[PDB]
Design a protein around this ligand. Structure first.
Ligand code: A1H3F
Length: 161
């Protein structure tokens, strides 16, 4: 198994008025190996805690340039994981206003996309999600709210409770 897996900084967490209608910031998750480097997912650094999705890393310890990051807390059913500390993204969607997906796909620059999320009624339960199709590897990119905070990630949605 290829042990090597690192992160690279794409940009910062900012709400943009104009849109399409170690240190804090977003990082793209990479895996260098035998052929080259490829993006597996995206994550969010905030309050000295790297947050991302479980299916990206799968409990794999990440490298932050020089220093190593081991995992701290995770959840497979929720599909979440935090490094160096507990989950510190308590904020969630208001349930009516529009939101901004800070999309960070492989081999292309980061950008904000303003959009109203749709509500879907899955056989398991009723969930809410953004109506934007992006490639796998973008999964783990943050969704921002009007007040600035992060309220979920790309890939999996959230249940209405
Ligand atoms: C679930 C579903 N069910 C049935 N059909 C489906 O698409 C059918 C069309 N398809 C054939 C292309 C979809 C669907 C629809 C869209 C997507 C794209 N996407 C969004 C996300 N992430 C995400 O939404 N995060 C999130 C977390 C918390 C809160 C919120 C918010 F507040 F913003 F709502 C969002 O991740 N991916 N993925 C699956």
């Amino acid at each position: 198994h290829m042990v090597d897996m690192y992160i690279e900084r794409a940009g910062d967490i900012t709400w943009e008025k104009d849109a399409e209608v170690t240190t804090d910031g977003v990082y793209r998750v990479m895996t260098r190996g035998l052929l080259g480097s490829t993006q597996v997912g995206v994550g969010v650094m905030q309050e000295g805690v790297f947050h991302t999705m479980w299916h990206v890393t799968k409990g794999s310890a990440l490298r932050s340039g020089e220093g190593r990051l081991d995992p701290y807390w995770g959840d497979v059913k929720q599909d979440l994981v935090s490094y160096c500390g507990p989950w510190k993204l308590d904020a969630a969607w208001d349930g009516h206003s529009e939101v901004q997906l800070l999309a960070v796909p492989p081999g292309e620059r980061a950008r904000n996309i303003q959009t109203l999320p749709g509500i879907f009624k899955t056989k398991d339960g009723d969930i809410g999600a953004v109506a934007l199709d992006y490639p796998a590897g973008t999964s783990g990119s943050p969704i921002l709210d009007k007040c600035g905070r992060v309220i979920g990630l790309y890939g999996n949605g959230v249940v209405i409770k």
